[PDB]
């Protein structure tokens, strides 16, 4: 409110009053959560984790080939 | 004169109705109930299908009642035996008997599953690309193994064995754990029947009949959630409303599952057990109402049909009839057996 | 011969994995099983005594019934010793409470749903409704 | 209700007891309670 206005005290007591009787909580829960988009099962396998395991396996095989090469020499 | 509308399986046409005339051409739940009421009260009756083909409503413009209720008020029909939901506006004009059947507003959606597990479900915990990749990786390990031997002391063979064993260990542990996740998630009863869950999500569009007590329930509802859903259904194009129940179900089946249909729990219970079992009912009922036999106001039939409905209810004729036209002829079966199967 | 042993090994691996998974589920969820599925199962089994209030529309429902199962239940309840009937609902619930589980109580779904949420909460409702009625203002 | 009953018809005395009894015999204007709707009660009094 503008300085020295007649509305300052009334709006102050207004915000306080509306806060104590729980209206603000109601409006907050109204416009944020209650109207929200995001609120079973669906569990499924993951190719990419096991793929990482494939990476460690291939690493093992490469090291194996190099070790074979150094073993022969 | 008994006025009624054709709705399944309340009033249906026989396989050959062409050679059949009178009350013998119609068959259904409402037909049987009609015969029983007429038996107890001892009156001769002729079933006639209502011309306009509506249940009942009051036009705001001309303020004239239509349908069953319409034919009832103006004296065109002596009694109306049909699936008529008891409402305030209808009770004000005409008298309703004690309700014979109890129903509620329910949601019908496409079935997520094909009705049974299979061999391929063994390959579920580990994806197909992972199968191809593990076989491929296996043959890679094999060719490396062959390349090691050239023409208990070693390095290359040791690390191949170790890495392969570690690999298959982690893989089979993943298989086991993921299968445990599958079965644990299959064992969960929860969540079942969450209220308002549709109201939040925008992924699935839902609709009701064009004219009926459901859409009207949404209209006058001051309740937050239903007001939200009605505000949604009112402003959505293409029109989310359907003309007939059959059209609604056929809309759900051809919608791939992105559409939900709000209808009466009875019609839902009926359609759910019909071949090829495409649809299921989800969530608890939004409200509780009941069907009732409607008689004109001040009629002599009101008290006898009331007492008749009560008498038939207490001796369990109604239950027998419902189980007769719903679950006993059901081709899909399942239902409670499916609940035990879950 | 090596392929026999290998394939057998893969097979048994799959099986033991499946078993372990299932048992893991079983131990995780822990869903208790109700002794009595439905009302007909009470008619099929002799052991657990079940009863209604001394005077009420429920006992009236049991006395006059033409269906086989209820007829049998009522033919059971009529002749029994000691008498299975109770005077008040509280006495019935308490009789379910001092039971050890050998007594079943037949009561309208409302009072049942109400008692299920009331301390100690030991009681619960099982099986569908035997009939569907409603309260009214007279 | 004085006697502490809902309602019944004794075959011997043919008299209604309880709230139903108070309703038929005019000792009470209206009955509001968990009163099970039954035919025998609907014959004597009006249920909503
Ligand atoms: C218009 C509303 C006041 S209402 O629909 O009547 N009641 C609302 C309330 C939630 C409700 C809803 C449904 C029922 C209800 C329950 C059962 C039945 C059938 C099985 C017959 N019951 S009966 O009328 O008592 C019988 C002895 C014939 C019919 C209606 C009872 C109460
Ligand atoms: C089947 C129809 C269209 C009727 C029957 N009772 C409700 C009524 O009397 O309005 C309607 C159901 C509904 O609108 O889903
Ligand atoms: C609790 C009592 C005695 C009442 C309540 N309703 C039923 C009635 O209105 O008769 C009775 C229950 C019963 O009969 O099991």
Curated annotation (Swiss-Prot), chain C:
Residues 20-138 are extracellular. The modification Phosphoserine is found at residues 65, 99. Detected in forebrain. Detected in dendrites of neuronal cells. Expressed in the pyramidal cell layers of CA1 and CA3 and in the granule cell layer of the dentate gyrus. L-glutamate binds at residues 57-58, 108. Belongs to the glutamate-gated ion channel (TC 1.A.10.1) family. GRIA2 subfamily. Homotetramer or heterotetramer of pore-forming glutamate receptor subunits. Tetramers may be formed by the dimerization of dimers. May interact with MPP4. Forms a ternary complex with GRIP1 and CSPG4. Interacts with ATAD1 in an ATP-dependent manner. ATAD1-catalyzed ATP hydrolysis disrupts binding to ATAD1 and to GRIP1 and leads to AMPAR complex disassembly. Interacts with GRIP2. Interacts with GRIP1. Interacts with NSF via its C-terminus. Interacts with CACNG2, PICK1 and GRIP2. Interacts with GRIA1 and SYNDIG1. Part of a complex containing GRIA2, NSF and NAPA and/or NAPB. This is Glutamate receptor 2. It comes from Rattus norvegicus (Rat). The gene is Gria2. The chain holds residues 619 to 756 of 883 of the full protein.
UniProtKB/Swiss-Prot annotation, chain D:
It comes from Rattus norvegicus. Induction: Down-regulated in the pyramidal cell layer of CA1 in the hippocampus by global ischemia. Coiled coil: none annotated. Homotetramer or heterotetramer of pore-forming glutamate receptor subunits. Tetramers may be formed by the dimerization of dimers. May interact with MPP4. Forms a ternary complex with GRIP1 and CSPG4. Interacts with ATAD1 in an ATP-dependent manner. ATAD1-catalyzed ATP hydrolysis disrupts binding to ATAD1 and to GRIP1 and leads to AMPAR complex disassembly. Interacts with GRIP2. Interacts with GRIP1. Interacts with NSF via its C-terminus. Interacts with CACNG2, PICK1 and GRIP2. Interacts with GRIA1 and SYNDIG1. Part of a complex containing GRIA2, NSF and NAPA and/or NAPB. L-glutamate binds at residues 34, 36, 41. Ionotropic glutamate receptor that functions as a ligand-gated cation channel, gated by L-glutamate and glutamatergic agonists such as alpha-amino-3-hydroxy-5-methyl-4-isoxazolepropionic acid (AMPA), quisqualic acid, and kainic acid. L-glutamate acts as an excitatory neurotransmitter at many synapses in the central nervous system and plays an important role in fast excitatory synaptic transmission. The postsynaptic actions of L-glutamate are mediated by a variety of receptors that are named according to their selective agonists. This receptor binds AMPA (quisqualate) > L-glutamate > kainate. It comes from the Eukaryota. Changing residue 39 to Y: Promotes dimerization. Strongly reduced desensitization. This is Glutamate receptor 2. The M4 transmembrane segment mediates tetramerization and is required for cell surface expression. It is found in: Cell membrane; Postsynaptic cell membrane; Postsynaptic density membrane. The record marks 9 as: Interaction with the cone snail toxin Con-ikot-ikot. Detected in forebrain. Detected in dendrites of neuronal cells. Expressed in the pyramidal cell layers of CA1 and CA3 and in the granule cell layer of the dentate gyrus. The chain holds residues 466 to 513 of 883 of the full protein.
